[PDB]
Symmetry: C4
Subunit: 388 residues, 4 copies
Amino acid sequence: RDFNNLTKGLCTINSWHIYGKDNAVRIGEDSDVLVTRGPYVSCDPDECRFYALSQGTTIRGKHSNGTIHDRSQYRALISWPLSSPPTVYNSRVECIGWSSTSCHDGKTRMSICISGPNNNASAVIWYNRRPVTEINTWARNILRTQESECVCHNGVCPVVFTDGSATGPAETRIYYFKEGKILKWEPLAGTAKHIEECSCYGERAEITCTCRDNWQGSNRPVIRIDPVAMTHTSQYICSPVLTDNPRPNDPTVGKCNDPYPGNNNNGVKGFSYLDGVNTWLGRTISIASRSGYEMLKVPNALTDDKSKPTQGQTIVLNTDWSGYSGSFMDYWAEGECYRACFYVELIRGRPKEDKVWWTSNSIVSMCSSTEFLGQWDWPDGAKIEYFL
Amino acid sequence: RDFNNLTKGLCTINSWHIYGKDNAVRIGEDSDVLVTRGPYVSCDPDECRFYALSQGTTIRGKHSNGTIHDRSQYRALISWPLSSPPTVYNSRVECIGWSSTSCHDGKTRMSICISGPNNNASAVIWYNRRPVTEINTWARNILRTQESECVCHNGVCPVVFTDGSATGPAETRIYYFKEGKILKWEPLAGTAKHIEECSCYGERAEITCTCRDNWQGSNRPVIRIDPVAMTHTSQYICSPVLTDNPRPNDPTVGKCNDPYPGNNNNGVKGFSYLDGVNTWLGRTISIASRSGYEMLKVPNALTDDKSKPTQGQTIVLNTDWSGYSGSFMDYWAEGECYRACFYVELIRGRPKEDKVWWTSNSIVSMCSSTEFLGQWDWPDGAKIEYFL
Amino acid sequence: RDFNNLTKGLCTINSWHIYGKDNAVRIGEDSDVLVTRGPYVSCDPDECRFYALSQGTTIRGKHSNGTIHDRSQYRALISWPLSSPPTVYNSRVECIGWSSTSCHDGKTRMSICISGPNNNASAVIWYNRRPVTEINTWARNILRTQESECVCHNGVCPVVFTDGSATGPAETRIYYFKEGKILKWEPLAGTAKHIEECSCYGERAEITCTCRDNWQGSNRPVIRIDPVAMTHTSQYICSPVLTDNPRPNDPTVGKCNDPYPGNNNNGVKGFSYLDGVNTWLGRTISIASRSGYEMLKVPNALTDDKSKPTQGQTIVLNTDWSGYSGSFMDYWAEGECYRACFYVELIRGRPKEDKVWWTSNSIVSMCSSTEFLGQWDWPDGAKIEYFL
Amino acid sequence: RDFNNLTKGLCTINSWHIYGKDNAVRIGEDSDVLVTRGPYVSCDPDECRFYALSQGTTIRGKHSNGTIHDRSQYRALISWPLSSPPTVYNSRVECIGWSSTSCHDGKTRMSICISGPNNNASAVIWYNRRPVTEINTWARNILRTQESECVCHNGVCPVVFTDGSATGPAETRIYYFKEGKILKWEPLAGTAKHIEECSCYGERAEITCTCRDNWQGSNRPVIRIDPVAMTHTSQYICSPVLTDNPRPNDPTVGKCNDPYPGNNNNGVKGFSYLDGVNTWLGRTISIASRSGYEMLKVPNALTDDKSKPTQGQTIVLNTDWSGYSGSFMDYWAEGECYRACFYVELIRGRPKEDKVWWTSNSIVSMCSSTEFLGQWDWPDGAKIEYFL
Ligand SMILES: *[C@@H]1O[C@H](CO)[C@@H](O[C@@H]2O[C@H](CO)[C@@H](O[C@@H]3O[C@H](CO[C@H]4O[C@H](CO)[C@@H](O)[C@H](O)[C@@H]4O)[C@@H](O)[C@H](O[C@H]4O[C@H](CO)[C@@H](O)[C@H](O)[C@@H]4O[C@H]4O[C@H](CO)[C@@H](O)[C@H](O)[C@@H]4O[C@H]4O[C@H](CO)[C@@H](O)[C@H](O)[C@@H]4O)[C@@H]3O)[C@H](O)[C@H]2NC(C)=O)[C@H](O)[C@H]1NC(C)=O
Ligand SMILES: *[C@@H]1O[C@H](CO)[C@@H](O[C@@H]2O[C@H](CO)[C@@H](O[C@@H]3O[C@H](CO[C@H]4O[C@H](CO)[C@@H](O)[C@H](O)[C@@H]4O)[C@@H](O)[C@H](O[C@H]4O[C@H](CO)[C@@H](O)[C@H](O)[C@@H]4O[C@H]4O[C@H](CO)[C@@H](O)[C@H](O)[C@@H]4O[C@H]4O[C@H](CO)[C@@H](O)[C@H](O)[C@@H]4O)[C@@H]3O)[C@H](O)[C@H]2NC(C)=O)[C@H](O)[C@H]1NC(C)=O
Ligand SMILES: *[C@@H]1O[C@H](CO)[C@@H](O[C@@H]2O[C@H](CO)[C@@H](O[C@@H]3O[C@H](CO[C@H]4O[C@H](CO)[C@@H](O)[C@H](O)[C@@H]4O)[C@@H](O)[C@H](O[C@H]4O[C@H](CO)[C@@H](O)[C@H](O)[C@@H]4O[C@H]4O[C@H](CO)[C@@H](O)[C@H](O)[C@@H]4O[C@H]4O[C@H](CO)[C@@H](O)[C@H](O)[C@@H]4O)[C@@H]3O)[C@H](O)[C@H]2NC(C)=O)[C@H](O)[C@H]1NC(C)=O
Ligand SMILES: *[C@@H]1O[C@H](CO)[C@@H](O[C@@H]2O[C@H](CO)[C@@H](O[C@@H]3O[C@H](CO[C@H]4O[C@H](CO)[C@@H](O)[C@H](O)[C@@H]4O)[C@@H](O)[C@H](O[C@H]4O[C@H](CO)[C@@H](O)[C@H](O)[C@@H]4O[C@H]4O[C@H](CO)[C@@H](O)[C@H](O)[C@@H]4O[C@H]4O[C@H](CO)[C@@H](O)[C@H](O)[C@@H]4O)[C@@H]3O)[C@H](O)[C@H]2NC(C)=O)[C@H](O)[C@H]1NC(C)=O
Ligand SMILES: *[C@@H]1O[C@H](CO)[C@@H](O[C@@H]2O[C@H](CO)[C@@H](O)[C@H](O)[C@H]2NC(C)=O)[C@H](O)[C@H]1NC(C)=O
Ligand SMILES: *[C@@H]1O[C@H](CO)[C@@H](O[C@@H]2O[C@H](CO)[C@@H](O)[C@H](O)[C@H]2NC(C)=O)[C@H](O)[C@H]1NC(C)=O
Ligand SMILES: CCC(CC)[C@H](NC(C)=O)[C@@H]1[C@H](O)[C@@H](C(=O)O)C[C@H]1NC(=N)N
Ligand SMILES: CCC(CC)[C@H](NC(C)=O)[C@@H]1[C@H](O)[C@@H](C(=O)O)C[C@H]1NC(=N)N
Ligand SMILES: CCC(CC)[C@H](NC(C)=O)[C@@H]1[C@H](O)[C@@H](C(=O)O)C[C@H]1NC(=N)N
Ligand SMILES: CCC(CC)[C@H](NC(C)=O)[C@@H]1[C@H](O)[C@@H](C(=O)O)C[C@H]1NC(=N)N
Ligand SMILES: [Ca+2]
Ligand SMILES: [Ca+2]
Ligand SMILES: [Ca+2]
Ligand SMILES: [Ca+2]
Ligand SMILES: [Ca+2]
């Protein structure tokens, strides 16, 4: 195998088709399904799999009580076959920790898991399923990373990390790994003022990451990385179609180089595909909670501060719970272009559904089509009442 | 691997021997077995597997309530090892949707799943376990397909779809795929007046499909496809041995080019092997409900409108529930001929057994023998009373 | 791969060491373990596995009620990893039926399963996991076979079948298969008067089978097969150490060419290794029930009608339940000789333990050592009281 | 594949990073997890796995009652994927017995399991998953071995066994195996007065084992083996930092060639890495019970009888239960040095938590880092109250 190179551009996105859905919470009501959160999808050259942060207990287990908590010693990055649920018996542990990223470089996979107390966390970088490099916290305040796949080009796999306050200036770093080793790292540059949980994809030797400004911005920060030069830039999506959550109502003009104000100290992981007129943004339908999910075609959203939608697709109705969302692509597919894909985490339980004592999720994921396909909505589908 | 070619003829069918049986409902009374319906069997060059449409819940799970419903967002085409039950832990998701077909072309497998609301469904064609082509609804009324395996010849795998009313004229199309891409498609031609759920097999470079006329006919429509010319014909099985269900009592003369009347707007997926004197038809024993199942040798059934049985084999007694049935063959077996095989879906639960709130099934499947073997009957075997 | 040839002799048996044990009934009290009976062990060139006739239900399942019954449509030959229990999720179905045999010829495996009603059963011979040949009942009275592995030599795998009364003269046949096809078959010859459930092994191009005379004999019938000439002989173990069950007390002189009398119309599958002074016989300790199990070294047992034990090893105490037993060897091991192995079925439930409504078993298996090792006893280990 | 040779030295240990954790007891509260004890970790050239002695029952099963007992016929050495829990469905049985060791030589794996009554136990040595050699008890008093991985060099895999009293002089032997066969064996020599459960690792063609003096010493005995010469030496860790348990408080001068007194007839399996200034010792935090676990850097601990700690890392708090601990390394990793690793058994249930009737454990394991990483504590995490 040779390292994969990002030689293709994105396929034209005219609509989104169903790719995978695990129905985990439904199935887990009567089977040994692990409690998770922070899911994602990532492909190897011969298979694509679902990934997530386990909570080290089944949903029906008594240890499901208290799983709203984010960082415990019982969490691990697990992967499992596409569209099956994350069960005790089919889940493969990639590494131990409560924050992660993972990507295949064409030869083998790199997985990164961070663990530890808030003031003393460390990342362990695994490559070819063995630990290779370790990075200690630099700001002693919840060292943390993407929560979705990283992207590689000719062996170089950039990864975005943040350490420091989630509600003020923090220390974000872009690490350039190759075979699990650090080639270089750089501090964040550009006009993004705060970075969290970047969702990335690659095309034509450029990696684009759409992140979460948890401090002040309801528009999303964007980091664009050149994996050959090992350099990057940052800005915000200019469009007035705001895609974080919670967020204020959409204005008619956005902000390119500063956080769009109105909501502080909160957000949700999200993503976008920024490709000139072939630009599609995801977002929750609700401006107040993680409810609903839609894709909007917003030509030149990255650079046009008045850009509005020209087409759309509802993924999850506003009467259904959503959650994190992120990008991934099958870089080893046939054809002349890379097909954009995304997943949506469907969060169930606390804090929105507090009759149960747990927090978990299921996954739904779609990929683009060049056809203009009919739309459906894809809820988690479980009935909370059954778990009482 | 090279694409498989249909170079052999059918083996002589003198009787049927047991091939596989999963006992899913029995086992599922106390194990994590998924609720399914619309099962089938399909072989790869190195393995044969069971397939079905999951309902995204176990049978003992509380989400089993309401599984009589046909089309939900929680369904998926799953496959699992021959004769094991479809469990949460061994079921491999092929694609997401509530109508499907799947077949191996000798190099890799094509799987097709349709999803969406009734007026806006779409098919996604997967090839080598990746999405390749998408087809939007053309008649905005439950785009749908075979519910059993497709057949390939030199890479070309024809698939029959229907979109439109299930109880009147509809728009049936024959698509010719190769490597998941559309080479051609044609509207139904010939004298079949309505087509549903075709069951197909191939021999000597011809593909024969036996379908369900849900509108007016109790005789079954037959589509014969030339996968090299990418052309087809259609008619009805001429024989007076009527094989749909429900159906009127058998007459002494059938109809070759029109629906045999007596029962409207209902039917059941079924199949036949039409090979001159080596012709065998399957059918439910009951004319009123999906009860019992038998194979009848009816020489020249396709073309002889007075043809009657010369031999038979009971598969499922009339005091046991049956359901859908369809054809498949192991195209990669040794020997000089293709051995005809079929499965029968054994439906349990609603609507016939309404003391439980679910609907599921188990599978029984047989293949032909050149011997004249003794017969047994093969019920699902589960006791409904145990699930109360 | 080339077909395996029986070029080695047996290793010297000085004692028996533990080889595998699945503890199925213990584990199955709280996990999805299938109800079985008629277990055995068989090796492939790269793995050795446990085999058995499933009853198509878990032990805790409500369908476990009535599993004392021998022949139902819900049975199948299943195999699973050595020493794991036969679970719903790890059991691989080899074929459907209620009587079986299976063996690897060095290239691939042949498995045979018989199914059907008592007066119309048929065997299906599978080879390379595909059905190849079928054999209809010849005496219309429970066509049936070994219940333990068959043995191959240069592709030829002889199999012993019986059809007819279990309590009087019956029609026993020796079939010689190669690649799942019938090369030849012969009626039983020699002085054995009734044959059931033969346990076989091979060494130096000769296959020796120790069987169960269910009609009149408490000594065991022996069939010796030449797989090159495709011919055989039969007699009884001459020794006065009687090894069927139930049986009369041991005399001082046995019978070589006729059934040793005292007990009619009953027996148990068993085995022996007959190799001059290196001869070891297995038997239940009790003369009245399937309780206890011991190995006795009885030099020249086959040909010496006064032969008595010179050494022994207790396998299962007389206060613990035993059951069927049979031979197998790893023909693909390293070294200069074939190591004799055997399994003992540990039957639990009915009819001896009738507080539960099921019948199942676990497995214990040993192989010979050239050392004189200390002995232990190996009970099933489950507490019946827990299942109440 | 060629046999692995110990050509590298240990990497510099500046801290320990999380490697694996299965959370077995937490998950097992509501899933089919086997009861175990005596766990360890061992790598093959392409995978690293968790190992342990099963008790042949699930934790929630009724057969969990009485699992404080050490030696039953229902135990087996099982292995399972790194960081998953030992479940009924994913656990692979390596051999049957209640004491074990296992190691890969670069070509295939050797596993050794001992079974039998106290006065008549025997070891069976498996190689390439087949039984090859057997060793009968030599002192008729619980023949027993390491309970953690063995180490190989150019095919030679030394293994330490003990037979005789656990509370007085016993007969310890060092066996040198190659391809499962005995090349040589030697009686213990040197100044160690009693040896139990050695934890070993290899570097630069030398194998170092840290053991448990169950008779008189609270300092640990050390055996150093030359696998080429097939010779060894023994002594005690000279340091006053005492690492057995229970144990007296630390003195200021230890003992190099005799047991450090104060506590008799008890101990716990443990380990160390003895590499000049790069020396790290593990131990329970409590001097009285198996509670807590810490790593201490004690330069020249092996040879300096006044050596004290210069650095440390807490692994398990003193308010959490610990248990056995042992060494392993991935000998097939990339790079120029071998990364030291260890596991800690987290024992739950009896005798410390007697509200439940079982005894089981979970696993936590770490490997060294050349960075100075922040520390966290890693408890088992299960709530006993949930199992009541
Ligand atoms: C069969 O399936 C097909 C294919 O899916 C179906 O066809 C699809 O139908 C969709 C629904 O109508 C349609 O999606 C919409 O597309 C609009 C763009 O098209 C229109 O404008 C362009 C440009 O002028 C024209 O060329 C075009 O012809 C159309 O006229 C989007 O604008 C739509 O999104 C907006 O509306 C929805 C509500 O429906 C919001 O949820 C969404 O966020 C957008 O509106 C908010 O945002 C904008 C931008 O700032 C604001 O201006 C606006 O006021 C809204 O703001 C409020 O709401 C947001 C969200 O809560 C909040 O943040 C904010 O603060 C405010 O409170 C929508 O995307 C598909 O394009 C169409 N596809 C095709 C191929 O045709 C077909 O219907 C199906 N058939 C049947 C029979 O069912
Ligand atoms: C051991 O096993 C062996 C092997 O299996 C057993 O032998 C098998 O025995 C079977 C049962 O007898 C037998 O199957 C029958 O074969 C008949 C054909 O053979 C006869 O006719 C030919 C032609 O003349 C002769 O050459 C031959 O020698 C025989 O005489 C079929 O005709 C049979 O099917 C009909 O009967 C059954 C009821 O038994 C129906 O279920 C079936 O649908 C057929 O009848 C309906 O349909 C016809 C056609 O239209 C009508 O004319 C008729 O009135 C019936 O219609 C009503 O019912 C249907 C169904 O509900 C409904 O739709 C309709 O409207 C009406 O209400 C049957 O297939 C096997 O061939 C034979 N095999 C061999 C190799 O011998 C042996 O018995 C076993 N031994 C023991 C001891 O058990
Ligand atoms: C550590 O482990 C080692 C290794 O396992 C242990 O050593 C083993 O000890 C075993 C038990 O003593 C021993 O097994 C016995 O071997 C006898 C043969 O040896 C003796 O005879 C020879 C020949 O003369 C001498 O060379 C030799 O030195 C000995 O003296 C067998 O004869 C024994 O079997 C008979 O006894 C047992 C009861 O213990 C029966 O269950 C068994 O069926 C045999 O007896 C029945 O059958 C014979 C034959 O027909 C009859 O003559 C007799 O009356 C019995 O018949 C009744 O019972 C049967 C069964 O229910 C019934 O069908 C019938 O109708 C009648 O009712 C036994 O096999 C091992 O060989 C020995 N191994 C070694 C290597 O030393 C050591 O003890 C262990 N240490 C500790 C401390 O525990
Ligand atoms: C972020 O994470 C980083 C990295 O982990 C954290 O930094 C780590 O902090 C650790 C805790 O302070 C520290 O570990 C200690 O290291 C000591 C060695 O360093 C000191 O001495 C050297 C040599 O002079 C100096 O160079 C150095 O600068 C330091 O001054 C060890 O000595 C420590 O172990 C002893 O203490 C602990 C209690 O904390 C005991 O559990 C342990 O067993 C040791 O003490 C017992 O044993 C000794 C030896 O015999 C006795 O002398 C002593 O009296 C104790 O004996 C009693 O207790 C034992 C155990 O129960 C019993 O058997 C006996 O009988 C007696 O009853 C300890 O290992 C790390 O090295 C340090 N790492 C780095 C890289 O800095 C940082 O804090 C974290 N940050 C935050 C904000 O949390
Ligand atoms: C990705 O690009 C690099 C070139 O920059 C390719 O690397 C060369 O691969 C060939 C085949 O192994 C070698 O002969 C060269 O030495 C490689 N290295 C470089 C840096 O030139 C790589 O093959 C490309 N990947 C694919 C899948 O084509
Ligand atoms: C078992 O014996 C037969 C010989 O009787 C061996 O068969 C020969 O195998 C070689 C290698 O494939 C061929 O060249 C010959 O044509 C084979 N056939 C015969 C009948 O001669 C077979 O190889 C032996 N098996 C092993 C494992 O050695
Ligand atoms: C405190 C910083 C947060 C991100 C801005 C926080 N990340 C971590 C590593 O704890 C996330 C946030 O609290 C949760 C959410 O917003 O859903 C998930 C939670 N993420 C994870 N548990 N992995
Ligand atoms: C409305 C058209 C019907 C076929 C003629 C219908 N097909 C679909 C895709 O819904 C089937 C029919 O209603 C059910 C049955 O007859 O058993 C199954 C049902 N099929 C599926 N749920 N896959
Ligand atoms: C009626 C003939 C019997 C053998 C002599 C009978 N065999 C079959 C195929 O039914 C066996 C016997 O009744 C049972 C036993 O003895 O344990 C098992 C039972 N064997 C199986 N169920 N496979
Ligand atoms: C009697 C000798 C003991 C070791 C010094 C004893 N070993 C065996 C083989 O029984 C261990 C000891 O009793 C237990 C413990 O200390 O935790 C485990 C127990 N070990 C195992 N059950 N494998
Ligand atoms: Ca924000
Ligand atoms: Ca359960
Ligand atoms: Ca009809
Ligand atoms: Ca008898
Ligand atoms: Ca001690």
